[PDB]
Amino acid sequence: DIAHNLAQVRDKISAAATRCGRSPEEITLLAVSATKPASAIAEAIDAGQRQFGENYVQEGVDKIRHFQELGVTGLEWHFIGPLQSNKSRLVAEHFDWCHTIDRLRIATRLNDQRPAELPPLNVLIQINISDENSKSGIQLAELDELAAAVAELPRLRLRGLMAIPAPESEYVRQFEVARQMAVAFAGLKTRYPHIDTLSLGMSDDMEAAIAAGSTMVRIGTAIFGA
Ligand SMILES: Cc1ncc(COP(=O)(O)O)c(C=O)c1O
């Protein structure tokens, strides 16, 4: 039951925020609807969910067109998958957020392809904080340079950081890795304008990420099933 699962997930978010002295409103729930049908999204919308994350461009754009066509207003779509240059125009024309900026050329393409009448595309720079197997994300040492370049792109808005840590079962390591991101986020936030988003945490490490300072958790399985 999607409605029931949304309520249950929001309950555990709220508790984890309150337990570590944070307001529940500090945490945005991003419902990851990738691989799920539009009808499952429509259920979530009827249950009050408004922010959806998609991993594949054409799948996401098709859904966005579907709900725009029903005149369903007020949604926020986040592209959270790796972005190839040949699909950037579709992202730039349809999505509200992109979490996976890890090279300047893809950001400049998105900026150039973003219609001027739209709001600037909110972007996060993706950090490979702990996954030796992943091709995605930059090293932290590259952050200052990339953030500076991205920040001048007028049709993008740099909002913060994202990371997909390597899978980790120990709470202690989940926390310390998320803290590495939170420290980097805080340092960016002191010099850059409108840094307010740390996209960090999924179903299995949600509590450590929230304790560490995440502002946005990306939940799929716990809402829609795997
Ligand atoms: C970036 C990102 N966030 C979240 C998820 C899903 O998280 P979970 O199903 O563990 O809640 C995935 C896709 O599986 C993902 O690629």
Author numbering: 3 to 228
Would you copy out the relevant sentences from the publication that reported this structure?
The pyridoxal 5′‐phosphate (PLP) homeostasis protein (PLPHP) is a ubiquitous member of the COG0325 family with apparently no catalytic activity. Although the actual cellular role of this protein is unknown, it has been observed that mutations of the PLPHP encoding gene affect the activity of PLP‐dependent enzymes, B6 vitamers and amino acid levels. YggS binds PLP very tightly and is able to slowly transfer it to a model PLP‐dependent enzyme, serine hydroxymethyltransferase.
We serendipitously discovered that the K36A variant of YggS, affecting the lysine residue that binds PLP at the active site, is able to bind PLP covalently. This observation led us to recognize that a number of lysine residues, located at the entrance of the active site, can replace Lys36 in its PLP binding role.
